[PDB]
Amino acid sequence: GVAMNPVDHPHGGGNHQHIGKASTISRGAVSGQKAGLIAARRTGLLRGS
Amino acid sequence: VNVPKTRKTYCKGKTCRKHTQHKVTQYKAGKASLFAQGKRRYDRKQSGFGGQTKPVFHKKAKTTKKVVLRLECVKCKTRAQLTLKRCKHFELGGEKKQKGQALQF
RNA sequence: CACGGACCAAGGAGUCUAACGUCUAUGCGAGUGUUUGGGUGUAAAACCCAUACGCGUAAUGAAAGUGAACGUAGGUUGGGG
RNA sequence: GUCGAAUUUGGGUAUAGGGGCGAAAGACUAAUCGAACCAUCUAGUAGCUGGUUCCUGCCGAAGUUUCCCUCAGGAUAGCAGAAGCUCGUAUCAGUUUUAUGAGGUAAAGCGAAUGAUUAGAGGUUCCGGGGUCGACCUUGACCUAUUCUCAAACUUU
RNA sequence: AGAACUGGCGAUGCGGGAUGAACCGAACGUAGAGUUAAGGUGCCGGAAUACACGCUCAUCAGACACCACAAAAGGUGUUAG
RNA sequence: GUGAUUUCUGCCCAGUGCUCUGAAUGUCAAAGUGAAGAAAUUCAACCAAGCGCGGGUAAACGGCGGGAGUAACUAUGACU
RNA sequence: UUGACAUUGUGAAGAGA
RNA sequence: GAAGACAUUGUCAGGUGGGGAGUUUGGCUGGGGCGGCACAUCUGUUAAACGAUAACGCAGAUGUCCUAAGGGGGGCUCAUGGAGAACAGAAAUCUCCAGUAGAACAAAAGGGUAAAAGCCCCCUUGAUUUUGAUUUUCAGUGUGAAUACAAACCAUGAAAGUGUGGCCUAUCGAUCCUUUAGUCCCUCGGAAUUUGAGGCUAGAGGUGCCAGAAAAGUUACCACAGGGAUAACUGGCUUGUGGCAGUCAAGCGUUCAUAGCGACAUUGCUUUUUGAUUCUUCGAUGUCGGCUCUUCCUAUCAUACCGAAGCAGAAUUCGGUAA
Ligand SMILES: NC[C@@H]1O[C@H](O[C@H]2[C@@H](O)[C@H](O[C@@H]3[C@@H](O)[C@H](N)C[C@H](N)[C@H]3O[C@H]3O[C@H](CO)[C@@H](O)[C@H](O)[C@H]3N)O[C@@H]2CO)[C@H](N)[C@@H](O)[C@@H]1O
Ligand SMILES: NC[C@@H]1O[C@H](O[C@H]2[C@@H](O)[C@H](O[C@@H]3[C@@H](O)[C@H](N)C[C@H](N)[C@H]3O[C@H]3O[C@H](CO)[C@@H](O)[C@H](O)[C@H]3N)O[C@@H]2CO)[C@H](N)[C@@H](O)[C@@H]1O
Ligand SMILES: NC[C@@H]1O[C@H](O[C@H]2[C@@H](O)[C@H](O[C@@H]3[C@@H](O)[C@H](N)C[C@H](N)[C@H]3O[C@H]3O[C@H](CO)[C@@H](O)[C@H](O)[C@H]3N)O[C@@H]2CO)[C@H](N)[C@@H](O)[C@@H]1O
Ligand SMILES: NC[C@@H]1O[C@H](O[C@H]2[C@@H](O)[C@H](O[C@@H]3[C@@H](O)[C@H](N)C[C@H](N)[C@H]3O[C@H]3O[C@H](CO)[C@@H](O)[C@H](O)[C@H]3N)O[C@@H]2CO)[C@H](N)[C@@H](O)[C@@H]1O
Ligand SMILES: [Mg+2]
Ligand SMILES: [Mg+2]
Ligand SMILES: [Mg+2]
Ligand SMILES: [Mg+2]
Ligand SMILES: [Mg+2]
Ligand SMILES: [Mg+2]
Ligand SMILES: [Mg+2]
Ligand SMILES: [Mg+2]
Ligand SMILES: [Mg+2]
Ligand SMILES: [Mg+2]
Ligand SMILES: [Mg+2]
Ligand SMILES: [Mg+2]
Ligand SMILES: [Mg+2]
Ligand SMILES: [Mg+2]
Ligand SMILES: [Mg+2]
Ligand SMILES: [Mg+2]
Ligand SMILES: [Mg+2]
Ligand SMILES: [Mg+2]
Ligand SMILES: [Mg+2]
Ligand SMILES: [Mg+2]
Ligand SMILES: [Mg+2]
Ligand SMILES: [Mg+2]
Ligand SMILES: [Mg+2]
Ligand SMILES: [Mg+2]
Ligand SMILES: [Mg+2]
Ligand SMILES: [Mg+2]
Ligand SMILES: [Mg+2]
Ligand SMILES: [Mg+2]
Ligand SMILES: [Mg+2]
Ligand SMILES: [Mg+2]
Ligand SMILES: [Mg+2]
Ligand SMILES: [Mg+2]
Ligand SMILES: [Mg+2]
Ligand SMILES: [Mg+2]
Ligand SMILES: [Mg+2]
Ligand SMILES: [Mg+2]
Ligand SMILES: [Mg+2]
Ligand SMILES: [Mg+2]
Ligand SMILES: [Mg+2]
Ligand SMILES: [Mg+2]
Ligand SMILES: [Mg+2]
Ligand SMILES: [Mg+2]
Ligand SMILES: [Mg+2]
Ligand SMILES: [Mg+2]
Ligand SMILES: [Mg+2]
Ligand SMILES: [Mg+2]
Ligand SMILES: [Mg+2]
Ligand SMILES: [Mg+2]
Ligand SMILES: [Mg+2]
Ligand SMILES: [Mg+2]
Ligand SMILES: [Mg+2]
Ligand SMILES: [Mg+2]
Ligand SMILES: [Mg+2]
Ligand SMILES: [Mg+2]
Ligand SMILES: [Mg+2]
Ligand SMILES: [Mg+2]
Ligand SMILES: [Mg+2]
Ligand SMILES: [Mg+2]
Ligand SMILES: [Mg+2]
Ligand SMILES: [Mg+2]
Ligand SMILES: [Mg+2]
Ligand SMILES: [Mg+2]
Ligand SMILES: [Mg+2]
Ligand SMILES: [Mg+2]
Ligand SMILES: [Mg+2]
Ligand SMILES: [Mg+2]
Ligand SMILES: [Mg+2]
Ligand SMILES: [Mg+2]
Ligand SMILES: [Mg+2]
Ligand SMILES: [Mg+2]
Ligand SMILES: [Mg+2]
Ligand SMILES: [Mg+2]
Ligand SMILES: [Mg+2]
Ligand SMILES: [Mg+2]
Ligand SMILES: [Mg+2]
Ligand SMILES: [Mg+2]
Ligand SMILES: [Mg+2]
Ligand SMILES: [Mg+2]
Ligand SMILES: [Mg+2]
Ligand SMILES: [Mg+2]
Ligand SMILES: [Mg+2]
Ligand SMILES: [Mg+2]
Ligand SMILES: [Mg+2]
Ligand SMILES: [Mg+2]
Ligand SMILES: [Mg+2]
Ligand SMILES: [Mg+2]
Ligand SMILES: [Mg+2]
Ligand SMILES: [Mg+2]
Ligand SMILES: [Mg+2]
Ligand SMILES: [Mg+2]
Ligand SMILES: [Mg+2]
Ligand SMILES: [Mg+2]
Ligand SMILES: [Mg+2]
Ligand SMILES: [Mg+2]
Ligand SMILES: [Mg+2]
Ligand SMILES: [Mg+2]
Ligand SMILES: [Mg+2]
Ligand SMILES: [Mg+2]
Ligand SMILES: [Mg+2]
Ligand SMILES: [Mg+2]
Ligand SMILES: [Mg+2]
Ligand SMILES: [Mg+2]
Ligand SMILES: [Mg+2]
Ligand SMILES: [Mg+2]
Ligand SMILES: [Mg+2]
Ligand SMILES: [Mg+2]
Ligand SMILES: [Mg+2]
Ligand SMILES: [Mg+2]
Ligand SMILES: [Mg+2]
Ligand SMILES: [Mg+2]
Ligand SMILES: [Mg+2]
Ligand SMILES: [Mg+2]
Ligand SMILES: [Mg+2]
Ligand SMILES: [Mg+2]
Ligand SMILES: [Mg+2]
Ligand SMILES: [Mg+2]
Ligand SMILES: [Mg+2]
Ligand SMILES: [Mg+2]
Ligand SMILES: [Mg+2]
Ligand SMILES: [Mg+2]
Ligand SMILES: [Mg+2]
Ligand SMILES: [Mg+2]
Ligand SMILES: [Mg+2]
Ligand SMILES: [Mg+2]
Ligand SMILES: [Mg+2]
Ligand SMILES: [Mg+2]
Ligand SMILES: [Mg+2]
Ligand SMILES: [Mg+2]
Ligand SMILES: [Mg+2]
Ligand SMILES: [Mg+2]
Ligand SMILES: [Mg+2]
Ligand SMILES: [Mg+2]
Ligand SMILES: [Mg+2]
Ligand SMILES: [Mg+2]
Ligand SMILES: [Mg+2]
Ligand SMILES: [Mg+2]
Ligand SMILES: [Mg+2]
Ligand SMILES: [Mg+2]
Ligand SMILES: [Mg+2]
Ligand SMILES: [Mg+2]
Ligand SMILES: [Mg+2]
Ligand SMILES: [Mg+2]
Ligand SMILES: [Mg+2]
Ligand SMILES: [Mg+2]
Ligand SMILES: [Mg+2]
Ligand SMILES: [Mg+2]
Ligand SMILES: [Mg+2]
Ligand SMILES: [Mg+2]
Ligand SMILES: [Mg+2]
Ligand SMILES: [Mg+2]
Ligand SMILES: [Mg+2]
Ligand SMILES: [Mg+2]
Ligand SMILES: [Mg+2]
Ligand SMILES: [Mg+2]
Ligand SMILES: [Mg+2]
Ligand SMILES: [Mg+2]
Ligand SMILES: [Mg+2]
Ligand SMILES: [Mg+2]
Ligand SMILES: [Zn+2]
Prior knowledge:
This is part of a larger assembly, with chains A and B. Helices cover about 0% and strands about 0% of the residues of chain A. By secondary structure, chain A is largely without helices or strands. In chain B, the strands form 2 sheets. Chain B has a 4-stranded antiparallel β-sheet, with no helix packed on it. The structure holds 6 RNA strands. The PDB classes it as ribosome.
């Protein structure tokens, strides 16, 4: 999605390739806004066994 | 400005037309009841769909507001309204200044 | 060294409508308007007509209201005839 | 460039316009795509370009005032045409004369105020401060009459 | 670039400035004759290669408002003072 | 999201988001109750999520400084 | 998503100013 | 079997909601933008001796402040300087003389004022009621501000008088709505009483883009109507800037102004620099450099002929006719 144009995906903002706003979306988010880490409780590398 | 809490001025009371003593208060506007016709016309407009209807002011350039002095007749009880010029600070019954005083402390 | 126009013919752009202002012509005139309708007919014409209605004959107040002669319907100064 | 596989391909079939479809170019969706094609609302609105059809006769402008989300536009007054009407030299006049006001520009003034500005001379500080000596000379500060040159925001005149 | 006053151009041809929005002269029905303006009168070109006193010789002389540029500084060129 | 293999992937959760069987009365609708009223109404209390508070979270979006002291010529600054 | 009202019937304890 | 008056379905209510829908995102402007306010105003000057008068002209100022810094009376006279007094010194408080304003009057500036308009003290609330007229701006509308009255009712002083805010020139606000006071008034139209509401007059809450919309961005994916009223090449005026050259000759050059040079100044040219401007072209004049080729300029690098030298020769340097 970060590779598309803004029409095709919220990520699709260009001129560099970056998401530009938090990649963690709410649960109460609306169809069409939900892309990326959806209900995400936490994020990043864990190493939790 | 500093104004006194009392002044002797002409009264329009039909019982006494002459300079009387007046309790000098300051104006504050009322609660603006919901049943004034405009407000129930507005709430009509405001309903349904179509979002905001009457405008919403934004561009305000005023620092102050004009100070309206209500004067209540001590005897005949009838109130009259008087308005001041613009001021940033207004106190009624403020402490009169005094000349020649040592600059304090 | 700004734009349209290679040429010819034909076509090609301030209209009608409703409500109005000034002005003018006309009818009648403190009145006026036959044509909604009816009568009538040589039949969309022409001719004719009741009741109404519209505007005018009073203004002024937001409104309840009130409602225009002291005087040859006034005084002074002009004024054509 | 690739050429035995994410290979090339027929036909059948599916997804349709703020929709599809996209190994992502805003690409593709019938020579049409940063929103298809068709008809209608639609003679859409245009302070913006363009055009606007016979002849003669008389008169004859404006780009200024004020207000405007006013500055390529309006309203407004002015300039202009027409229609006239009341009267017949009543009244006037982009002119002078005489009488009587008002003005502070040009010029002028700075040994007048103000502000600026060159030069000496005289006179108190007996110094503001240091020296020469167990009070005399420099420095400045003031003061007096002079001298050169200035003013849109100086000025008697 | 921007004000003041008036005159103009625009909206206007005519004669003059060769040429030309705005300069000079003059403003315009159709014509004849006379006279002029501004400008001209060697030849182009209508009009004295007119009269008069001087000055000027330039191996880019100069030649007429607006107007189509030249300065300081020099010259034992020549002229007057 | 990143983009084979190898190797490594640091610091920062204050912000913007995401997330939490985390303290609260702080704010907080409509229905509901209470008070006053002849009623229309006014006035209160109580109160959901949310906000507000608190916790976590950067292979979430993203961030990684300006100053000065300081070692025997100078210089630099392992040090504060 | 949250509350209310209605779909909405039948019972029991034990608690709130 | 599970599940159970939960849930689901329904209707309101609060929250969330660029996923989606609309819409919007000033003006002036030596192009736009950025800045700025020349957008509402005030003083001085520009302004050309009535009045008016422009530029993003020059020096400044305003969105305030004051129960007195308003109103009246009275006494008094201020800047500043000289000469004089325990500590007391430059600076304390006291005195006399001088003192046309050289001070003060909120503030910008200008004007105005000396038995005051200043300082000081005394009393008051004309910073009030009513409602018209007049001046500035002007359309002779509004608004702001102001002037002279009338009708009341007050202050002040012995009084005559003066006072309708601040000595004068600036210090501000429509309709719609809300709101408060006033008249105790009108109306809710089948008739009444109360509550509520709607009026009349007068204030306030504000529009500073100040005659008064309710408003964020991006587009190199772009679009339309126009514009040479307008920027980005040429060309045109200008020549500050850039380039080139004069004049005077203090000085340089051992000596010696000028062989060769040249400060302070000053007169110029040029348009292969850059600006300034915005006339031409926006229904289109192909935008850098190079290559190629022609021709012109001369402010001459070489070459021909020369003059000068601080030219012995050699070299060099200055110059003339030369493109
Ligand atoms: N020659 C005398 C001088 O000039 C004048 O005197 C007289 C005339 O020269 C002067 O004429 C002036 C004229 O200059 C200029 N146009 C101004 C003004 N409009 C004229 O004056 C006249 O104007 C019109 C009539 O024309 C009248 O309505 C007006 O009342 C009258 N004063 O009008 C003056 C009175 O009739 C000045 N008053 C004065 O300088 C002095 O007397
Ligand atoms: N006023 C009458 C006229 O005065 C004229 O004379 C004028 C001048 O001569 C005279 O100037 C005198 C001067 O003469 C005398 N020697 C010195 C004196 N200070 C000057 O005085 C004048 O100038 C000074 C400024 O210099 C001003 O401050 C002063 O007010 C002014 N009057 O001032 C006079 C004007 O005030 C003529 N004599 C004549 O036309 C007639 O008499
Ligand atoms: N040159 C002397 C010194 O310079 C100044 O003073 C000089 C001037 O300022 C002063 O000039 C005169 C004066 O003589 C005379 N008596 C009084 C006059 N007002 C002064 O005027 C001076 O100032 C005014 C502006 O205020 C100027 O307009 C005027 O041109 C100027 N001369 O006199 C001095 C000589 O002309 C200093 N004030 C002072 O130290 C001392 O006098
Ligand atoms: N080379 C061998 C000889 O030397 C000769 O000698 C010449 C050179 O040494 C020197 O000439 C110089 C030259 O060096 C330099 N590069 C150019 C400069 N313009 C010349 O200058 C000379 O010659 C020119 C033109 O002829 C003259 O106008 C000038 O007066 C003269 N000084 O000066 C001599 C001529 O005056 C020539 N170079 C050459 O022709 C001859 O055969
Ligand atoms: Mg892309
Ligand atoms: Mg998006
Ligand atoms: Mg992006
Ligand atoms: Mg990109
Ligand atoms: Mg890119
Ligand atoms: Mg990347
Ligand atoms: Mg990335
Ligand atoms: Mg987002
Ligand atoms: Mg009485
Ligand atoms: Mg409703
Ligand atoms: Mg609703
Ligand atoms: Mg009042
Ligand atoms: Mg007032
Ligand atoms: Mg041309
Ligand atoms: Mg065109
Ligand atoms: Mg053409
Ligand atoms: Mg063409
Ligand atoms: Mg054609
Ligand atoms: Mg053509
Ligand atoms: Mg042909
Ligand atoms: Mg008619
Ligand atoms: Mg028939
Ligand atoms: Mg009738
Ligand atoms: Mg009566
Ligand atoms: Mg009678
Ligand atoms: Mg009469
Ligand atoms: Mg008579
Ligand atoms: Mg390849
Ligand atoms: Mg191969
Ligand atoms: Mg296929
Ligand atoms: Mg469709
Ligand atoms: Mg759309
Ligand atoms: Mg679908
Ligand atoms: Mg593909
Ligand atoms: Mg793209
Ligand atoms: Mg096609
Ligand atoms: Mg296609
Ligand atoms: Mg394409
Ligand atoms: Mg598009
Ligand atoms: Mg299609
Ligand atoms: Mg087709
Ligand atoms: Mg049409
Ligand atoms: Mg239509
Ligand atoms: Mg229209
Ligand atoms: Mg326009
Ligand atoms: Mg506006
Ligand atoms: Mg045009
Ligand atoms: Mg007109
Ligand atoms: Mg007329
Ligand atoms: Mg006179
Ligand atoms: Mg003067
Ligand atoms: Mg003047
Ligand atoms: Mg002068
Ligand atoms: Mg003089
Ligand atoms: Mg003075
Ligand atoms: Mg003074
Ligand atoms: Mg001396
Ligand atoms: Mg005299
Ligand atoms: Mg000009
Ligand atoms: Mg003039
Ligand atoms: Mg002229
Ligand atoms: Mg004309
Ligand atoms: Mg003419
Ligand atoms: Mg001619
Ligand atoms: Mg000529
Ligand atoms: Mg001519
Ligand atoms: Mg002349
Ligand atoms: Mg001849
Ligand atoms: Mg001549
Ligand atoms: Mg010439
Ligand atoms: Mg030329
Ligand atoms: Mg010459
Ligand atoms: Mg000469
Ligand atoms: Mg000579
Ligand atoms: Mg000689
Ligand atoms: Mg001689
Ligand atoms: Mg990632
Ligand atoms: Mg990649
Ligand atoms: Mg990391
Ligand atoms: Mg953080
Ligand atoms: Mg955080
Ligand atoms: Mg946290
Ligand atoms: Mg509630
Ligand atoms: Mg309940
Ligand atoms: Mg929860
Ligand atoms: Mg903690
Ligand atoms: Mg951050
Ligand atoms: Mg830094
Ligand atoms: Mg650091
Ligand atoms: Mg440092
Ligand atoms: Mg450092
Ligand atoms: Mg250091
Ligand atoms: Mg240390
Ligand atoms: Mg150190
Ligand atoms: Mg060290
Ligand atoms: Mg060291
Ligand atoms: Mg360090
Ligand atoms: Mg260091
Ligand atoms: Mg540390
Ligand atoms: Mg629910
Ligand atoms: Mg519940
Ligand atoms: Mg229930
Ligand atoms: Mg239960
Ligand atoms: Mg959204
Ligand atoms: Mg949108
Ligand atoms: Mg603009
Ligand atoms: Mg913009
Ligand atoms: Mg700007
Ligand atoms: Mg105005
Ligand atoms: Mg004003
Ligand atoms: Mg003037
Ligand atoms: Mg004047
Ligand atoms: Mg007095
Ligand atoms: Mg004195
Ligand atoms: Mg003085
Ligand atoms: Mg006073
Ligand atoms: Mg003053
Ligand atoms: Mg004064
Ligand atoms: Mg006096
Ligand atoms: Mg009296
Ligand atoms: Mg009075
Ligand atoms: Mg006032
Ligand atoms: Mg108001
Ligand atoms: Mg009201
Ligand atoms: Mg009342
Ligand atoms: Mg009733
Ligand atoms: Mg009723
Ligand atoms: Mg009532
Ligand atoms: Mg309002
Ligand atoms: Mg508004
Ligand atoms: Mg505006
Ligand atoms: Mg602004
Ligand atoms: Mg305006
Ligand atoms: Mg947009
Ligand atoms: Mg540009
Ligand atoms: Mg130059
Ligand atoms: Mg030039
Ligand atoms: Mg130069
Ligand atoms: Mg050159
Ligand atoms: Mg020497
Ligand atoms: Mg020599
Ligand atoms: Mg340069
Ligand atoms: Mg142009
Ligand atoms: Mg140009
Ligand atoms: Mg063209
Ligand atoms: Mg073009
Ligand atoms: Mg072409
Ligand atoms: Mg060509
Ligand atoms: Mg092309
Ligand atoms: Mg170019
Ligand atoms: Mg030459
Ligand atoms: Mg040579
Ligand atoms: Mg060379
Ligand atoms: Mg020698
Ligand atoms: Mg050599
Ligand atoms: Mg050589
Ligand atoms: Mg040379
Ligand atoms: Mg050649
Ligand atoms: Zn009373």
